[PDB]
């Protein structure tokens, strides 16, 4: 049996409800028992999944009553009222009618204001520029939305050989993300050239945030 | 209280073999069905199998993916779950959480275990190095670059400083593992006070601390 979640993610404001799709390729309705063999389950980044759900809409123990699970054959869904910073998660629709399977999940994200990421730029330690390579950082911290375009530029020209970004989750204390740019060069081409920026072009302004450094100036 | 804990991950060739265990407690073992579901990182659940309970004879199933190539057992004396796995690949990449499942009524897995990380991959361990990333309020960061396999676990003063913190998801390029994490601070407490990033990599008996200095 084929399990399929629909949308992958979405975003729902603080105090709002959100309503999650999970489709079966044939019927989990055991007619013996008049019971959608159907579970929901919550997880939390980095952290061991938990049943919300059974038998379509029913709440697991010390689920509180603002989570709700319908639905029936193949066609169900979840619904969260009252969507606060605890829920940030996938969840998972599982069906357990003839052995067991998992949907794909749906990401729930926070919808929150708009915000312009905090902008910092790092040469290469001293310790690493001892070392056989240079690595230049940038991190773009508590922005939001999450999607955001950096450049690196290196004595004026853009740079893409060797920059490699990484996104944190959605974060739990205000609901922004944050990304890192790395750029790693070897130490001779680091020492090759002197001007080094970082450009975050986000939605938030029609001007990108540059910060800069002259390898010369440190 | 139930218990469920997994043991047995790490890094392992492909094409070899491994041992999971799933060690249990707080409830009546041989009630239950149990099962094994694995998640690569970053991507969904996928369910592998099960072993039924007392009443249905112990007997197993498996899903289509490890059919035949994984083995579930039980030691009821232990209150003790295992999956034995061959003929390892990459795309079994995955941590192994075990769930304790069916009891002939109930239709869920209310129990979960914290998971074992397995690696496939023919990448050898490699320890990190820590780097510092020196500069209202004041972001300063680590580098930890050049490590395999994951996990590694950054934390700032031992873990007294956790506001403020992103710790970013690691990249892997020519198998080596590179993350930074920054932490934000006040001015007025940096660089009056001290700041240290510990690194740890289990895989490699690795313990690092490295002072931020201005
Ligand atoms: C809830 O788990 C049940 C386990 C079992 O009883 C079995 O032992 O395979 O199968 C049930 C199917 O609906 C087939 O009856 C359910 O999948």
Known sequence: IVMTQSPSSLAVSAGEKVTMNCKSSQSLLNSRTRKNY????????????????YWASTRESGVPDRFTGSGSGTDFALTISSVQAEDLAVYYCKQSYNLRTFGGGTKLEIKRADAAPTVSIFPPSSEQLTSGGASVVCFLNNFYPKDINVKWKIDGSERQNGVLNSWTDQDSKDSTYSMSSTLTLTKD?????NSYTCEATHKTSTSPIVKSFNRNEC | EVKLVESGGGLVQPGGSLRLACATSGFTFTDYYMSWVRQPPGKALEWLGFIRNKAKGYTTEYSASVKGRFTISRDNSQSSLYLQMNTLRAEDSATYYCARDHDGYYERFAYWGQG???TVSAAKTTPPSVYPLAPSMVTLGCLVKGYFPEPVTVTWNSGSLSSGVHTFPAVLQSDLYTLSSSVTVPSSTWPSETVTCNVAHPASSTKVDKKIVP
């Open chain 1, 38 to 53: 159907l579970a929901w389950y919550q997880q939390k980044p980095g952290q061991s999944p938990k049943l919300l759900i």
């Open chain 1, 189 to 193: 081409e680091y020492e090759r050239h």
């Open chain 2, 116 to 118: 074992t990380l397995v």
